[PDB]
Amino acid sequence: KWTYFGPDGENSWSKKYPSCGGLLQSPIDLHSDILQYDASLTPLEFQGYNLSANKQFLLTNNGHSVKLNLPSDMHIQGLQSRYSATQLHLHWGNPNDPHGSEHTVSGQHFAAELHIVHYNSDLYPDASTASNKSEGLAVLAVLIEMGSFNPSYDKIFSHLQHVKYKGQEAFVPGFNIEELLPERTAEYYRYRGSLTTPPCNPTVLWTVFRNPVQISQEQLLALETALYCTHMDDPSPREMINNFRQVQKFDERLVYTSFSQ
Amino acid sequence: KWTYFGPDGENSWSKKYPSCGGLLQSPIDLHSDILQYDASLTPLEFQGYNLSANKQFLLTNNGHSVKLNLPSDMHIQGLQSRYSATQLHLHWGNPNDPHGSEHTVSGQHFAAELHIVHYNSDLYPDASTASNKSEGLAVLAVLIEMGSFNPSYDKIFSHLQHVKYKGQEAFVPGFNIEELLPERTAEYYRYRGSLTTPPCNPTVLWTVFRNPVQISQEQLLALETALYCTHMDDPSPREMINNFRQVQKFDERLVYTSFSQ
Ligand SMILES: NS(=O)(=O)c1c(F)c(F)c(S(=O)(=O)CCO)c(NCc2ccccc2)c1F
Ligand SMILES: NS(=O)(=O)c1c(F)c(F)c(S(=O)(=O)CCO)c(NCc2ccccc2)c1F
Ligand SMILES: [Zn+2]
Ligand SMILES: [Zn+2]
């Protein structure tokens, strides 16, 4: 039982989930003092991201975020194991302070952040089993800023009203998941970290793309206002807002970059 | 026991100190979304700050920071109650990332931060009894940036190499504590928050001055490198670095500013 606000909020996660007070925690502020260019980092290749429009994919409000299930045929190459997709989900702020990304860059939050979660399918049978094991997970993070209307993100956002409450599910027709990625994916930040939610396992290889994408003011407000953390029938409904973790200490370590300027 | 790094670091404070997981936690990022000018915020008066040069004040390495005791005849006037001084202390980062303020401004961490802690002497007999009481504490924060040498801060820093280890103490001849404050003290941010160390009591009226002061690179390096969290005895010394808390969520709330933007 955990939240992002109140008694069971992030400073208390370590009570029930010891790893939330352990090693390698994410997210972090990405800033120049902890960055080191690594010329060996290569562009990731995204395979099977173009999902068939004749297929459909489950969108679930899980009480903490809205997730879209992704098929294990979607994978990334360019890492030292094949990683296969499991789901994507988002983090955001609130209409009074619409700056809810998890990673920050030079101190600055972006409006929101997409995570595409993959698991090490060379070592592990599925995502759950991978999640608390060495080299288990790889997550792609895309920073989102307010800007132009984004029809690709609308392929998810247009279904939000069908997953308003915890446990509610809706199907989303296949679309090209690559369209959720930015410009010049070749430039990114890379570091070893953790899940940013309980149980906070330090088993995540992060890739945060350097370049943000844009979604409109209206799209971001729709995201921030659409969802609730609680089930329909909860006596005390709670809006799903500010579902991002504060940045963690990141000391005597380095984030590697695929870009040197 | 509590620390800023490892199993007893800040995500685990709420285990021993429940208020660290409660409401009204400090420090925070001070950014436009959550700022509001309040014309009724008047200049504080700093009375008794010109400490007797014929008196000495105890400086102590307490294993968490370096603290200077201050006398109760030093006070702030301007609030609903008189608040009298109890001690001042600093927070800093480390030489590889010399950004260890507690409060941030528009996401920007300053080099270090000075806190001058006061208690409500009208209502309570001393700081320790005031600290878990409503209106109990008022802390002044001065953001510190690397630049020019600061002869006033050296009145404290020149003693650092003499309180290297936990429990060690020096005496500081009285000097004018107002010399530690930045220009235009009438310009500040004001909010209700907490102690930023265990027990994290939500009993602090914060006043963070708008303008930073400067200390030299050499001063900052001495502050970052002089001190240990451990006793002189210890065969496993721990460097007293990165002794700042990460910023806290601050939602549905405002910080009031005595300056307009
Ligand atoms: N931000 S993160 O990518 O570290 C993250 C979440 F924020 C998160 F909420 C989750 S979730 O499992 O609570 C579903 C909500 O999106 C996962 N999941 C990683 C994972 C995937 C499959 C099995 C176990 C863990 C997750 F990886
Ligand atoms: N950031 S802060 O201004 O809120 C702060 C500290 F950082 C700090 F280390 C201390 S400490 O040195 O006393 C030991 C850990 O709490 C206090 N102490 C304020 C205080 C003074 C007298 C009685 C009760 C609390 C304290 F108030
Ligand atoms: Zn996530
Ligand atoms: Zn302090």
The answer to whether the CB of B117 is under 6 A from ligand 2 is yes
Contact yes or no for B84/B130 (Cβ under 8 A): no
DSSP secondary-structure letter at A186? T
Contact yes or no for A177/A116 (Cβ under 8 A): yes
Q: Catalytic residue at B64?
A: yes
Is B89 annotated in a binding site? The answer is yes
- The token pair that represents A117 in the structure block: 């979660």
The answer to whether the CB of A128 is under 6 A from ligand 1 is yes
Which residue, judged by its Cα, is nearest atom 27 of ligand 1?
A195
CB contact under 8 A, A34 and B97: yes
B254: number of Cβ within 10 Å: 14
The answer to whether the CB of A112 is under 6 A from ligand 1 is no
Give how many domains chain B has, as a whole number: 1
| A to B CB pairs, distance under 8 Å | 82
**Which amino acid, residue A179?**
E
Q: How many Å is the Cα radius of gyration of chain B?
A: 17
Q: Report the alpha-carbon distance of residue A260 to residue B136 in Å, rounded.
A: 50
**Which amino acid, residue A145?**
E
Q: Nearest 5 degrees, angle CA B127-CA B131-CA B137? A: 80
Min Cα separation B190/chain A (Å): 19
Q: Report the alpha-carbon distance of residue B119 to residue B215 in Å, rounded.
A: 28
Q: Which of B94, B108, B246 sits opposite A247 (nearest CB)?
A: B246
Q: Which residues form the domain of B59?
A: 1-261
The answer to whether the CB of B67 is under 6 A from ligand 2 is yes
- The token pair that represents B39 in the structure block: 């014309």
CB contact under 8 A, A249 and B9: yes
Contact yes or no for B98/B116 (Cβ under 8 A): no
Q: Are strands B204-209 and B137-147 parallel, antiparallel or unpaired?
A: parallel
Contact yes or no for B28/B191 (Cβ under 8 A): yes
Q: Report the alpha-carbon distance of residue A189 to residue B15 in Å, rounded.
A: 33
Residue B144 CB burial class (10 angstroms; 0-12, 13-18, ≥19): buried
Q: Say which CATH number the domain at B238 has.
A: 3.10.200.10
Contact yes or no for A246/A13 (Cβ under 8 A): no
Q: Report the alpha-carbon distance of residue A248 to residue B40 in Å, rounded.
A: 36
Min Cα separation A112/chain B (Å): 15
Q: Which residues of A are catalytic?
A: 64
Unique residue bearing structure tokens 């941010």: B189
Q: Report the alpha-carbon distance of residue A111 to residue A107 in Å, rounded.
A: 13
Instruction: Report which secondary-structure segment, H or E, holds A62.
Output: none
With H, G, I as helix, E, B as strand and everything else as coil, classify residue A247. Answer: coil
Q: Report the alpha-carbon distance of residue B183 to residue A180 in Å, rounded.
A: 48
Burial A178-213 (b: 16+ CB within 10 A, else e): eebbbeebebbbbbbbbbbbbbbbbbbbbbbbbebb
Contact yes or no for B12/A10 (Cβ under 8 A): no
The phi and psi torsions of A2 (rounded to 5 degrees) equal -160, 150
Contact yes or no for B9/A249 (Cβ under 8 A): yes
Contact yes or no for B27/B202 (Cβ under 8 A): no
Contact yes or no for B61/B240 (Cβ under 8 A): yes
Contacts of B13 in chain A (CB under 8 A): 11
A contact test, residue of B8, B17, B249, B252 with most A CBs within 10 A: B249
Q: How many Å is the Cα radius of gyration of chain A?
A: 17
B32: number of Cβ within 10 Å: 9
The phi and psi torsions of B224 (rounded to 5 degrees) equal -75, -20
B238: number of Cβ within 10 Å: 15
What does the H/E/C string look like for chain B? CCCCCCCCCHHHHHHHCHHHHCCCCCCCEECHHHEEECCCCCCCEEECCECCCCCEEEEEECCCCEEEECCCCCEEECCCCCEEEEEEEEEECECCECCCCCCEECCEECCEEEEEEEEECCCCCCHHHHCCCCCCEEEEEEEEEEECCCHHHHHHHCCHHHCCCCCCEEEEECCEHHHHCCCCCCCEEEEEECCCCCCCCCCEEEEEECCCEEEEHHHHHHHHHCCECCCCCCCCCCECCCCCCCCCCCCCCCEEECCCC
CB contact under 8 A, A246 and B246: yes
Q: Report the alpha-carbon distance of residue B121 to residue B125 in Å, rounded.
A: 6
The answer to whether the CB of B208 is under 6 A from ligand 2 is no
Q: Which residues contact A199 (CB under 8 A, 6 or more apart)?
A: A17, A19, A20, A132
Nearest to B147 by CA among B89, B92, B91, B219: B219
- The token pair that represents A72 in the structure block: 């294990």
For residue A245, the chain B residue with the least C-alpha distance is B249
Exp. method: X-ray
How far is C-alpha A56 from the chain's CA centre? 21
DSSP secondary-structure letter at A5? S
Nearest to A91 by CA among A210, A213, A206, A197: A197
CB contact under 8 A, A247 and B248: no
Q: Report the alpha-carbon distance of residue B239 to residue B40 in Å, rounded.
A: 43
Sign of CA dihedral A192, A113, B246, B128: negative
CA of A176 to the centre of ligand 1 (A): 21
Nearest to A92 by CA among A68, A59, A115: A115
In Å, the largest CA–CA distance within chain A is 55
- HSE-up of residue A212 (Cα within 13 Å, Cβ side): 18
Contact yes or no for B55/B74 (Cβ under 8 A): no
User: Omega before B199 cis (within 30°)?
Assistant: yes
Please list the residues that pair with B120 across neighbouring strands.
Answer: B83
A118: number of Cβ within 10 Å: 29
